[PDB]
């Protein structure tokens, strides 16, 4: 709820709830989350099967 309410973050950051994954959606393409103690872990590159990565780089 908070990540979808920030005036400068509301558009471009797609999130979920799991049972979260701060991906990108529309316009802005680059996203990055960083913390110190809690987590902000993993990479899980979105760019899939070259084509997705290639389409962006082209």
């Amino acid at each position: 709820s908070q990540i979808e309410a920030s005036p400068t973050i509301k558009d471009g950051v797609n999130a979920s709830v799991t049972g979260m994954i701060i991906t990108k959606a529309g316009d802005n393409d680059f996203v990055k989350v960083t913390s110190i103690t809690p987590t902000t872990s993993i990479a899980a590159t979105t760019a899939d099967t070259a084509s997705a990565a290639l389409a962006s780089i082209e």
């Binding site: 979920s16 799991t18 049972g19 994954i21």
Partner: protein, 46 residues
């Protein structure tokens, strides 16, 4: 181990275009007089 997944939206992309055409039809013929008013014989004089 979690194995827990997520869910997204149905996003589809399509390109649509509708086209038409045009043709001009004309019908004409060499003039052989023309529909006149008071078609009567005449006797010109100078």
């Amino acid at each position: 181990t979690r194995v827990h997944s997520y869910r997204g939206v149905l996003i589809i992309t399509d390109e649509l275009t509708v086209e038409a055409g045009s043709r001009v039809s004309l019908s004409g013929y060499v003039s052989d007089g023309g529909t006149s008013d008071v078609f009567t014989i005449c006797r010109l004089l100078d």
